[PDB]
Design a protein around this motif. Structure first.
Motif, PDB file in Angstrom:
ATOM      1  N   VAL A 165       0.825  -1.199   0.000  1.00 46.62           N
ATOM      2  CA  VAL A 165       0.000   0.000   0.000  1.00 46.62           C
ATOM      3  C   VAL A 165       0.866   1.257   0.000  1.00 46.62           C
ATOM      4  CG1 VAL A 165      -0.170   0.209   2.510  1.00 46.62           C
ATOM      5  CG2 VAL A 165      -2.003   1.113   1.058  1.00 46.62           C
ATOM      6  N   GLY A 166       2.168   1.067   0.181  1.00 43.07           N
ATOM      7  CA  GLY A 166       3.089   2.187   0.201  1.00 43.07           C
ATOM      8  C   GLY A 166       3.789   2.392  -1.130  1.00 43.07           C
ATOM      9  N   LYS A 167       3.009   2.463  -2.204  1.00 48.34           N
ATOM     10  CA  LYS A 167       3.561   2.660  -3.542  1.00 48.34           C
ATOM     11  C   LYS A 167       3.477   4.132  -3.954  1.00 48.34           C
ATOM     12  CE  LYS A 167       2.811  -1.961  -5.466  1.00 48.34           C
ATOM     13  NZ  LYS A 167       2.271  -2.598  -4.235  1.00 48.34           N
ATOM     14  N   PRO A 168       4.619   4.849  -3.972  1.00 48.78           N
ATOM     15  CA  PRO A 168       4.653   6.269  -4.352  1.00 48.78           C
ATOM     16  C   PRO A 168       4.060   6.512  -5.736  1.00 48.78           C
ATOM     17  CG  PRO A 168       6.764   5.601  -3.444  1.00 48.78           C
ATOM     18  CD  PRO A 168       5.962   4.344  -3.625  1.00 48.78           C
ATOM     19  N   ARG A 169       3.688   7.760  -6.001  1.00 49.35           N
ATOM     20  CA  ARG A 169       3.106   8.128  -7.284  1.00 49.35           C
ATOM     21  C   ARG A 169       4.163   8.131  -8.384  1.00 49.35           C
ATOM     22  NH1 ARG A 169       1.621   9.326  -2.031  1.00 49.35           N
ATOM     23  NH2 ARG A 169      -0.652   9.624  -1.927  1.00 49.35           N
ATOM     24  N   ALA A 170       4.296   7.000  -9.069  1.00 46.57           N
ATOM     25  CA  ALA A 170       5.271   6.870 -10.146  1.00 46.57           C
ATOM     26  C   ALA A 170       4.740   7.467 -11.444  1.00 46.57           C
ATOM     27  CB  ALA A 170       5.640   5.408 -10.349  1.00 46.57           C
ATOM     28  N   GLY A 171       3.484   7.906 -11.418  1.00 47.41           N
ATOM     29  CA  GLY A 171       2.879   8.493 -12.599  1.00 47.41           C
ATOM     30  C   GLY A 171       1.510   9.078 -12.318  1.00 47.41           C
ATOM     31  N   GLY A 172       1.449  10.011 -11.373  1.00 45.08           N
ATOM     32  CA  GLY A 172       0.186  10.635 -11.025  1.00 45.08           C
ATOM     33  C   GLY A 172       0.349  12.085 -10.612  1.00 45.08           C
ATOM     34  N   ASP A 173       1.264  12.333  -9.681  1.00 42.43           N
ATOM     35  CA  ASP A 173       1.519  13.686  -9.197  1.00 42.43           C
ATOM     36  C   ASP A 173       3.011  14.000  -9.221  1.00 42.43           C
ATOM     37  OD1 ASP A 173      -0.961  12.488  -7.548  1.00 42.43           O
ATOM     38  OD2 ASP A 173      -1.273  14.646  -7.815  1.00 42.43           O
TER      39      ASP A 173
END
Length: 35
Positions: free
Chosen positions: A27-35
């Motif tokens: 659940v700790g997946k950073p925004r690699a393609g969103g923000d």
């Protein structure tokens, strides 16, 4: 006796919160393609 000493050390410390850290990776997946 390594099998008996391994189960003994498991009771001495007795984990618990470490289980939360595991799921905290999925659940700790950073925004690699969103923000």
């Amino acid at each position: 006796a390594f099998r008996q000493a391994l189960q003994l050390a498991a009771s001495g410390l007795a984990g618990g919160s470490a289980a939360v850290l595991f799921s905290a990776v999925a659940v700790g997946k950073p925004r690699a393609g969103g923000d």
